[PDB]
Amino acid sequence: AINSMSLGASYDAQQANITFRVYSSQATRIVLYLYSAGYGVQESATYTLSPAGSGVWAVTVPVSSIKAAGITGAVYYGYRAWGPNWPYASNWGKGSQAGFVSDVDANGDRFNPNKLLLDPYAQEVSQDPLNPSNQNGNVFASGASYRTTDSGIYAPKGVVLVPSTQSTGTKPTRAQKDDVIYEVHVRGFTEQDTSIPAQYRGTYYGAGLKASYLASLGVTAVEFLPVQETQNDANDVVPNSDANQNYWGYMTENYFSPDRRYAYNKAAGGPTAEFQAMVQAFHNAGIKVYMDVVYNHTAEGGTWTSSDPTTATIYSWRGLDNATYYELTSGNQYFYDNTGIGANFNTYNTVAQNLIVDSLAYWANTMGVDGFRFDLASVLGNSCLNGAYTASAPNCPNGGYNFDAADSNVAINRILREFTVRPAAGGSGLDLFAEPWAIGGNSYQLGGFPQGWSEWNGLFRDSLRQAQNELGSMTIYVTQDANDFSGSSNLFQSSGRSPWNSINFIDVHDGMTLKDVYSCNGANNSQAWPYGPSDGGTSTNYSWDQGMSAGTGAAVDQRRAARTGMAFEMLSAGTPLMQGGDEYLRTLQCNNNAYNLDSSANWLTYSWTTDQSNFYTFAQRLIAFRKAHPALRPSSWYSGSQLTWYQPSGAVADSNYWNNTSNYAIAYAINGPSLGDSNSIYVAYNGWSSSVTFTLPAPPSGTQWYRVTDTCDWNDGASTFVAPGSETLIGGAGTTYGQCGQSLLLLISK
Ligand SMILES: [Ca+2]
């Protein structure tokens, strides 16, 4: 169930009382601290909580008592907990060591009463651990040097919210197969956009104002990088330096709270009502709002070092019940990790898992979000509970990490039974997307997720980048191109899934932008502000500048390649995903891991050159085309009568062709009418470095072929992709077409 324990802080109907409920299976004592401000002040009152059974502790406070304590505005709160490793000593006082036994005990408890704790169910956070007033993270650490430090006035406080009456509009019921996703950072979306009033730039409010921009481009779903509270308030303390910045936000501090830094209205309840108003603006434009969520690790991380089990950050989950929330190593002194951040969130533990479900429900229901893309999703399929084996995790015999999509108790299956996934034909429900990998063990699971889950297709990205940029360096399989274009049945069909479950993309936030994969011979992450430096992303970008540096290529060529890559994702069966900015050839000058760049090089710009504006026209018409032709969006795997593979000779691609590893050109035709389309279409990819002549087959429907686009250099301009009705008559069966090397041809029959 959802909200099985009714955790959190909430007012009763008449706002006469607030009830605080919090879980801890090991705590010995839990005490509520109330503050009038989130930072810099001591508490106005404290209330000892009482065991309400099943590990939940509760207390109900009358509002009059709160006002009597001096708190007449918003109620900021936190907890102080005691446990086996640090029991309550009657002489303990803030900043005292009284009662201390150990920083961590044999069972993994890490209680420290000197650390004020943020409720995991807080719906809003006052400020991040590091902010403009304090950038010393040591006040939150355990260990001999810092355990007695009282973090009270520096620690983040939760805000008790009065239910918002803000509408989130009506949720689109469009089938996922008909969507075109646009990934963008909520702050970089409008931060330097002069078409938005300055005060709204880089905020939720500002993003809502760009709904029309997205509608003209033609995308149907915006996917935001993490919006749940992340460490970002100290980003601008030191100017012209990415040193202490966290831009992307893959360090969640709280799972129910919209990040305050991204809101225009920063008052208590402001980020919340503003995020709701923002999705209303999108929902009004008929656009879905997806959220990138990260439940594989927490911002608290693990131990500071792998040799000292005593020092770790404590401000939320860890202080309340470390053994419940994190996956500990055998012996419980350290953390088990498959994320590389320091510690796995214990996704297999019921209470930890309930938090994932409960926060997802909050965002989907109260916040109006239409779907979620799960970062390092394989950690949510872990059937282990600890570094060592435990009978409670029967399916994880070796302990540690073990992905098991058949275990009904892993987080990815729990989600499926608590929520309704949108049907293939549309209707209400959620759209769930997984990045099917993590770090180590059997975590790489592309094609391993259950029905109900779509996945980020890394093989689509890589194989096509290779086909365009690695000719001669590595083997390119013409059969893989085919798989890519047809919805990767090789990955999705055996599980009973469909082509639209393949999220096809050439580029995402991780790695290079579209322009960059065709303009960079490698990553360049060591530039100075505002382009770097950034500590390395992948070593395998499969990028190439099209001969630019060698003198065998030029700018048109990089644009020809970018046109070809975008066409691959927009023409292929599956659900296309483009990175915001790719519509104007956004570049990061080859930085392929810009996660710490909260700068102008990273935000989007809307002042474009002719060549950039020309690309936007290409992108806009290509997205419009996909949306106008159902034959490109099959709900099920193309049947044999619906799609025919052709060799350049106009002859059907046979086994001799498929098994010949020196064949780089491929073409196909789809029977438009059989898929409910008005035209049949023919796509040709010349993966060869030189000109290839394609002999057109007989149109499945209609009598003649008309050219829609040719990505080749000669066709570079404002009209490389024609407007509907201006297709150039090429010819019928037998007509030939000379296709330049490394490019794509699009044709419709009439
Ligand atoms: Ca923040």
UniProtKB/Swiss-Prot annotation:
EC number: 3.2.1.68
GO cellular component: extracellular region
Subcellular location: Secreted
Residues holding Ca(2+): 128, 229-230, 232, 259
Cofactor section: Ca(2+)
Cofactor binding, note field: Binds 1 Ca(2+) ion per subunit.
Stimuli inducing this protein: By maltose.
Domain of life where this protein originates: Bacteria
Disulfide bonds: 384-396, 520-590, 712-740
Pfam assignment, any one: CBM_48
Site label Transition state stabilizer, positions: 510
Record's catalysed reaction(s): Hydrolysis of (1->6)-alpha-D-glucosidic branch linkages in glycogen, amylopectin and their beta-limit dextrins
UniProt keyword list: Calcium, Disulfide bond, Glycosidase, Hydrolase, Metal-binding, Secreted, Signal
GO BP annotations, alphabetical order: carbohydrate metabolic process
Active site per database record: 375, 435
GO molecular-function terms, A-Z: isoamylase activity; metal ion binding
Record text on subunit structure and interactions: Monomer.
Family indicated by similarity: Belongs to the glycosyl hydrolase 13 family.
Protein name: Isoamylase
Lineage summary: Bacteria, Pseudomonadati, Pseudomonadota, Gammaproteobacteria, Pseudomonadales
